[PDB]
Amino acid sequence: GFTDYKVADITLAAWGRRELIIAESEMPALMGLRRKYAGQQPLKGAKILGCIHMTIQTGVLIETLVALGAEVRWSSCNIFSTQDQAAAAIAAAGIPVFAWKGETEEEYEWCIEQTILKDGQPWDANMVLDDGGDLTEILHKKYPQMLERIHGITEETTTGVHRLLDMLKNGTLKVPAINVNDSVTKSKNDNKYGCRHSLNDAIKRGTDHLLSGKQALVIGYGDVGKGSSQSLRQEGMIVKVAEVDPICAMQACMDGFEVVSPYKNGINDGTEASIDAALLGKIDLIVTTTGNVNVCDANMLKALKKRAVVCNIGHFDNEIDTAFMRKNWAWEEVKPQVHKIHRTGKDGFDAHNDDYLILLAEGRLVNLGNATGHPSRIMDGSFANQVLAQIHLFEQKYADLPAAEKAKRLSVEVLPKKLDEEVALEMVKGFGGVVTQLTPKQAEYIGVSVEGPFKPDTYRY
Amino acid sequence: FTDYKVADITLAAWGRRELIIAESEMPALMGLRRKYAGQQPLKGAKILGCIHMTIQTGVLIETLVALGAEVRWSSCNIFSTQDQAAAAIAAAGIPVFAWKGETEEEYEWCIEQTILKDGQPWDANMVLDDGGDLTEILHKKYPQMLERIHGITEETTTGVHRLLDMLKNGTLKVPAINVNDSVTKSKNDNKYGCRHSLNDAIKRGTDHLLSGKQALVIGYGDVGKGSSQSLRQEGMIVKVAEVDPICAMQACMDGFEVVSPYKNGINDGTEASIDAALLGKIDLIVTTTGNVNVCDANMLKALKKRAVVCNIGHFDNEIDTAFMRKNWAWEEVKPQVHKIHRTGKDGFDAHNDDYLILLAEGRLVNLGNATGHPSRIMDGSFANQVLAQIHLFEQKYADLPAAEKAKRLSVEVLPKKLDEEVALEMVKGFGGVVTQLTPKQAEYIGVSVEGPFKPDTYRY
Amino acid sequence: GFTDYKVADITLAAWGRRELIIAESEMPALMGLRRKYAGQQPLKGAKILGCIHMTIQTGVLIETLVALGAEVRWSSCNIFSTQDQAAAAIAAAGIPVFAWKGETEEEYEWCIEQTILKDGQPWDANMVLDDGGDLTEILHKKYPQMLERIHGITEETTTGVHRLLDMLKNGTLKVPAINVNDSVTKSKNDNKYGCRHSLNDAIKRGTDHLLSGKQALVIGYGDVGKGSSQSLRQEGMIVKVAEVDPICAMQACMDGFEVVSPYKNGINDGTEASIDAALLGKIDLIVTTTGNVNVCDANMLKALKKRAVVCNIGHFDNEIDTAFMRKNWAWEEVKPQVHKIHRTGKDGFDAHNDDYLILLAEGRLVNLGNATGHPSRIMDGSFANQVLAQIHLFEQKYADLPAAEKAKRLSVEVLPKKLDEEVALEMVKGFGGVVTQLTPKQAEYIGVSVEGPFKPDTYRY
Amino acid sequence: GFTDYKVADITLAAWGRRELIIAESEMPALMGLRRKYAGQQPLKGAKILGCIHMTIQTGVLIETLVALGAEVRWSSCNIFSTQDQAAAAIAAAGIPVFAWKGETEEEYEWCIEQTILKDGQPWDANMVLDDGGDLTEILHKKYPQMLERIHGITEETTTGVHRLLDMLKNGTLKVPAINVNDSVTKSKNDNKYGCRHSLNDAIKRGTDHLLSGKQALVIGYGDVGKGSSQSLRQEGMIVKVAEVDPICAMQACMDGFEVVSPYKNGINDGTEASIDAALLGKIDLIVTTTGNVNVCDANMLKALKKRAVVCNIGHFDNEIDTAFMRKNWAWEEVKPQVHKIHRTGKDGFDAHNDDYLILLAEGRLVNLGNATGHPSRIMDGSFANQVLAQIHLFEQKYADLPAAEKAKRLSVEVLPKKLDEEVALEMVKGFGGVVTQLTPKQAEYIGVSVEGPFKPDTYRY
């Protein structure tokens, strides 16, 4: 008689379970942790609030946490990112999950509240696993009594880590966090290769456009921008890159991309006159990758080539000024998470109008909104880090420390390099890769253990 | 002017024509030349320099001199000098001791001619090093000169490793700047420089088709990443070896098969541990590690007939060339190309089929068989070298009280703001246009509109 | 009260129409023909039996034939290739179409029969548009009388053209044909670049597998093999290629692939001992591209690495020995067109068994079965050629010619190079591409017209 | 006392011989022919006039002809293409060769005449091996009596075949020819992948310029322009392509290039105003690949970005208007085959002038002029076809045919596909590739012999 969940359709569970059984075979780092630690039950007593895209990959993460002893209550961190078969399979396993594809904002907030509250009162949570910081913010603003008994936060993504550091700087962070994003087996695997796999995927599923021979503009060349640029260049797009960071721009030039600004001399006045209309009038596809605000602005949207695709793969939809488009232009749904936005005006359009843009996932993360996000074998790295981070903070028991002892551990830290390497090794073995073992003489020559770690903490890979 | 030794001074006019082209390819370095000419920030600097005597190094040397410095220069490798570059520098009245094809004895004699002027220690007060050989000779043989030296700026991964070892052991006597770990060095030169120059060197030495053939790249650090791409972009089927599982994961995701020369990755020192089936299919092996003996005698015995062997790490002992010199007959094809006949030491059949081709006698192949990295890439490295010389010279460490010294005795990198300023001049060189953050966006991500744009933790 | 159709769900018509309007914007060659010829109605009196994948792209073709004066009756040429929203939109425009995704063989045969018959009697067809030759063969074997009134066949694909050339050599071909496949703007566009876009697309939709770092074997390196190999390599697969043709093998080597045989020394002795078990045990993905029979045989399937994906992008499913798999192994449906094939035997599978292969689209064309086939901007070339071919053979009126005139025109021919060039020019202008105009001096220098054709008939591009 | 040669430096022979011995190991098709035919001496009595770039590769070809029984007299077909060590090694083997790197035009013509004449009178030539048609033209215009006793011409390159086809159409061709260029193992090997190898090679040797991140324009997208574009794109250049052939242009778009014209709307109006000065002012590198005249004209050269590199890889230097630059601008030699062309005027220049172009090889084929041309393993295919073509025409003995029989055989033909396949098979084996053998059932299914040929003559690969 399990009823503590809300999903689109519980009858999708058998399909979900079939896809989780496949995903386990694609996630050797995560299933290596499930096997190594099952006997010790390192998360026995852990009560984890989780807010991360309710995908098949997240299903394998949740079932690993539970297999190691945890109880969880789960929600998705985006209105369009749930895979309803994954949510159904987790609910069918007796796990509280509140998530469906195509939530309203009001439904999204309700789902997070259903994880925080059990039977109308605060759950006895003692751990947080977050992607983006929405759940972390809600606890700090609305449930400070709950944070007293929470040992830590493990945060998936660049934007969430930024939010945590902002809190730590202001003295408002209440519990220590692990920056899961900045493991190399997360940042330089998931953020880059995941977007390489999933950006072109999402654009094909939404539009079935040919990409070969068409013009793209990628805004940003961080980890997401580098993967996104490759996703499109490998398909034969002519890609131009925009950046504010000249080091990232230098990489884009060396990687074979032209570096351009939407604005004349890179100076945005706020005026239409500052827009490079000739440049934007040639672009078939714009992708935002920044974690910043209004990097695809109203004046750019007005200047884009007719019938251009617009999408965002950064964490939050405000990278694109979709509010401007909702206020001024007519939205025609092609199919779910695909809109033609008619620049002829707000009330009504001609069905054969040529002056439209195609917006994917209403500006929300397009890989998860229009496809299935990153593949299992990539999310293996991110989620093996999540499990190690949950074990570490749970074992430290911050909530039970005296005040003077809390003050010494209240930090946002990354996992040790040795753990990042042990995750990587399982990922390499999963490809059938064979790492060389250093001879004792070689290990002495370069000043490392045969076991590693192999690099200094300053190393950038 | 006679205070120099080069292959042929008559090559000076050609070297000057190529320096004028290189200046047009090096906007970051020429931007510094123009920004700081007025102030003469290196007036009174006396720089001992030991780095590959190429056209690119010529532009560095003339930048230092234009900013007020005096220099004395040698190459840090027996095969890396461009004789036209060394001639142009000598013709400009700068002391330089370098030629392509030095013996080891000539190599040591060149470094000693920088250290000594007219038979006595030069009054040197700055060091610019690539690989640590000059640093090491000053510490072991000329410790007194180090009492008047304000610091060392070190170019390469291997040299920085040697500096950090000295610092660990308390033997380092002057502070150093790790130039290698600017992003506009490590993630520019080490990677993209090898992408440009490895296939260049192979083609000039052998003129072999690369497309369709099998390569093994040992290492997947910055040099191994660039080397793998140099080969893959030509259509090679590239396999990668690594001891670092994170670097191996990157190779797998970059589309390479990750393999070991040894069964299960375990080198037990015996022939039985060699994966003979794997090595018997390899047409090209490239070492990129900065480690010792990563292409060993048993690997060399197992390689496919007529495989090419080369090293692009700093030192020749990545490959066991000593083994080949002791066991096998060397046939010079042309300078820096040898066929190594596996049939015996004291002769070979001119038509023997059982040989390897060794490039640059196992020394850095890009510089030995071609011209190393291109100007527009070395612009990043060398703009960092100039900023690093200006910083340590302005700090005047040799002139500080003992207590002040002990606090400044470190191996540091340049600040990120300077790395970003070098990158911006490189981007403008390509006609790239960086976007300016709005005040609202700068507030939103918590940075200055001017930068720096990233925390020190950021890996790019 | 139109009712002369059978589709999955007429209510999908509005969605189909939205996608057709987008597809028109992606198909400048085909809509250039619709606009150039509308006034002249060159297919006035044409009654076309068509049997080509009922996709959005085929809808733009159909509505082009109709806009130039044709009547059509339409079936799909594959049980899984129909897009139900495309079939619905065509049914809704009052065109007879018999097609849905997931037909049985019996339902496939029934749909072809509904195009051939109108009200229980042979339709007064006078033109055939075919893909693969099945409708051509049915007319020749079962409705020979109908071929007396038919002016010609236009055939889309390599396999269909092979079958026509066989009929012509045996004297069994009754009407003239145009080989549409061998326009350069078909064979060197669709067959190659279409499979580049759509093979990785279909594998991602079916499995969501990471491709980067995994081992593929592509059987064949013709136009489909070339595009398929690029589809996988550009995602970071380690691709090996098999071939029987040493010229195509040479091209694969030069393109940077290792050329291997599933068989020791390339010799299939029919025994397990001739299988290269070491090679096949490292393969994560096998793709058949040959148009030949049993190129992924039972012994190969037994030797494949556990959890390998198996698929076919050739015209017919017998490239893979799926009959062996149905007889011997247990099929578990993951979701439509995705089956795990448990190598543990016939009489039950374990949900958690690790010893299975994944078969896509039951061995049928994977790009059309698991995704949407080639994109509109590629099918533009193929379908502009189809329209030109239909116009040409309909204008020649073979059925109306005296016997001695017929004998001189009974051929399998390609379209003239000038029309291939004019299709190409419209495709290039669709990218914003600008061709140079030869000066008269340069035209004279190379022996051509400023207007083209630019190349001799021998030219291979 | 052999003296019947002229080379730069006979002391380079031992170096040339060392490189020939390495080249033999890289040319398995050509050394397979040497082994197959040495016993039968099929070129016993052949007296071959040869005019083809005097490289190491050409050396292996010459020594193969000689090993099969031929005598030759040799010249280079370009003033800058000779490798002096190769010429020295051939002279040291007692073979008449007249060739050095850096000939004047007068020396070039003299070398060809030294092959034609032995001891001041016509040599008893009976075969011709040409690359570009210059020897063929001289024999037709100046030595018709020598053509009476010649059995055939074997022509290497696209430009030479065009010249033969013009002579055949005008009835002026006096002996039959084999078009070697249009073997697939020539045109789709040498012309494409040779230039892929050798273009970037020559640019790096001449300039040592970084190519990554810079802007290129390739004029033409036939076999040489396809290879050239890839040489540059694989280095990270941003490549734009010009074409007059829309089918070639459609290939460029689909391959991921922007297709542009040096002229506004592609139309040369006779004036500077029709030059797209905005486009050319961004180009760092222009490469001509056309076999046409003045495709990089004076007005394009005036508009190019300061410090741009200019080069040609088509057969003749007149692709670029170098006569304009010689008449109007000051040439500064950087080093051999590298000139800075100062656009500030003819008389002199400032050493630090910024307003110059860098011209490679004085506009002569840049791969051979600034590097070593194509590699041995590619030239293997071309030169195996040359040997087969020499055997074929020498065996046919056209010179000895009566007039009525000559008229039936006077043709420009390609080698049969079976021989092109046999060359490709030796090249594939050279890579370690393994071709699959068709089973009898598969051979019947696709209508071919198990031995091949595998494709119809219409097939384009």
Ligand SMILES: NC(=O)c1ccc[n+]([C@@H]2O[C@H](COP(=O)([O-])OP(=O)(O)OC[C@H]3O[C@@H](n4cnc5c(N)ncnc54)[C@H](O)[C@@H]3O)[C@@H](O)[C@H]2O)c1
């Ligand atoms: N969709 C996914 O699956 C996914 C995966 C990982 C991360 N993310 C999210 O993607 C975003 C980017 O993450 P990341 O790891 O690449 O961050 P990052 O810091 O590595 O890169 C962002 C880049 O944006 C650039 N930028 C900022 N403002 C700009 C502007 N106005 N114009 C141009 N460039 C500008 C920065 O200079 C920086 O290099 C974050 O919101 C992150 O949480 C999404």
Ligand SMILES: NC(=O)c1ccc[n+]([C@@H]2O[C@H](COP(=O)([O-])OP(=O)(O)OC[C@H]3O[C@@H](n4cnc5c(N)ncnc54)[C@H](O)[C@@H]3O)[C@@H](O)[C@H]2O)c1
């Ligand atoms: N030729 C050039 O122009 C050039 C340019 C830059 C640096 N360098 C030199 O190249 C070398 C490498 O520099 P880097 O910056 O790439 O260093 P790095 O530390 O980034 O990379 C070296 C890699 O070698 C790997 N490795 C070590 N031992 C190994 C073994 N036994 N088998 C397999 N892999 C092994 C390490 O795991 C590491 O990832 C250094 O010697 C450096 O000074 C040369």
Ligand SMILES: NC(=O)c1ccc[n+]([C@@H]2O[C@H](COP(=O)([O-])OP(=O)(O)OC[C@H]3O[C@@H](n4cnc5c(N)ncnc54)[C@H](O)[C@@H]3O)[C@@H](O)[C@H]2O)c1
């Ligand atoms: N799925 C699609 O959208 C699509 C697109 C175009 C064509 N097609 C179909 O794809 C198939 C191939 O078409 P194509 O145009 O590439 O034909 P093709 O003749 O160009 O190539 C087929 C290749 O298969 C090779 N081959 C044959 N038997 C082989 C074997 N046993 N092992 C290895 N290689 C073998 C041949 O040598 C040949 O090079 C045909 O059935 C055609 O109708 C499908």
Ligand SMILES: NC(=O)c1ccc[n+]([C@@H]2O[C@H](COP(=O)([O-])OP(=O)(O)OC[C@H]3O[C@@H](n4cnc5c(N)ncnc54)[C@H](O)[C@@H]3O)[C@@H](O)[C@H]2O)c1
């Ligand atoms: N350097 C080498 O080693 C090498 C190798 C092979 C061939 N070649 C020579 O290269 C040249 C090209 O040979 P190919 O086999 O590529 O010929 P091709 O006929 O395949 O291609 C030449 C292309 O140039 C295009 N073209 C002609 N005029 C043009 C113009 N004004 N603007 C743009 N495009 C234009 C044509 O449309 C055609 O596609 C010939 O001279 C040939 O002899 C040189």
Ligand SMILES: Nc1ncnc2c1ncn2[C@@H]1O[C@H](CO)[C@@H](O)[C@H]1O
């Ligand atoms: N399939 C997936 N399942 C769960 N989270 C994912 C998936 N694809 C991408 N993400 C995550 O989305 C985050 C952005 O909210 C990224 O940091 C990444 O770790």
Ligand SMILES: [Hg+2]
């Ligand atoms: Hg979340």
Ligand SMILES: [Hg+2]
């Ligand atoms: Hg999120």
Ligand SMILES: [Hg+2]
């Ligand atoms: Hg750039």
Ligand SMILES: [Hg+2]
């Ligand atoms: Hg040095």
Ligand SMILES: [Hg+2]
């Ligand atoms: Hg060095």
Ligand SMILES: [Hg+2]
């Ligand atoms: Hg791997």
Ligand SMILES: [Hg+2]
């Ligand atoms: Hg069909």
Ligand SMILES: [Hg+2]
């Ligand atoms: Hg079909």
Ligand SMILES: [Hg+2]
């Ligand atoms: Hg010639």
Ligand SMILES: [Hg+2]
């Ligand atoms: Hg020639």
